[PDB]
């Protein structure tokens, strides 16, 4: 669920997830999609697009089972198809988030999403 993702974000980024990425760019956090602003927003772009490949669940409400191993995210204990995927979706968006931390814009942290150009289809 979305609380798990928020934790997941913090554990690889060290920043409070909703505080820093809840309104970042045009695809991070609540709201729709847009043409991404930077690599930080674009990995939120990838997250929302793997989130549409979910089938039988509510990712923002349904929790899953996962653990935080030797600084490595292991969702890999047996999970139902969706709950496996969203959590892998969350881990992938948690992992890339650490990969573009040097790019993070402090001005994009709360971004006016309506003004962003509409994203294509994933």
Numbering used by the authors: 1 to 122
Q: Which passages does the manuscript contain on this structure?
A:
Phospholipase A2 (PLA2, EC 3.1.1.4) is one of the representative toxic components of snake venom. Group II PLA2s are further categorized into several subgroups based on the amino acid at position 49. In contrast, Lys49-PLA2 lacks phospholipase activity, or exhibits minimal phospholipase activity because the catalytic Asp49 is substituted for Lys4–6. In this study, we comprehensively analyzed basic protein II (BPII), which is one of the Lys49-PLA2 homologues isolated from the venom of Protobothrops flavoviridis (PflLys49-PLA2 BPII).
The crystal structure of PflLys49-PLA2 BPII was determined at a resolution of 2.57 Å. The asymmetric unit contained four molecules of PflLys49-PLA2 BPII. These four molecules were superimposed well relative to each other with root-mean-square-deviation (r.m.s.d.) values less than 0.5 Å for the Cα-atoms. The relative orientation between molecules A and B was similar to that between molecules C and D. However, this dimer was superimposed neither on the conventional dimer nor the alternative dimer previously reported. Furthermore, basic residues were located on both sides of the interface, and the surface charges of both interfaces were positive. The area of the interface among four molecules was less than 350 Å2. Based on these observations, we concluded that the conserved relative orientation between molecules is merely preferable packing in the crystal and PflLys49-PLA2 BPII does not form any oligomers in the crystal. However, all cysteine residues formed intramolecular disulfide bonds in the crystal structure, and thus, intermolecular disulfide bond formation is highly unlikely. PflLys49-PLA2 BPII harbors seven intramolecular disulfide bonds, thus 12% of the total 122 amino acids (14 Cys residues) contributes to covalent bond formation.
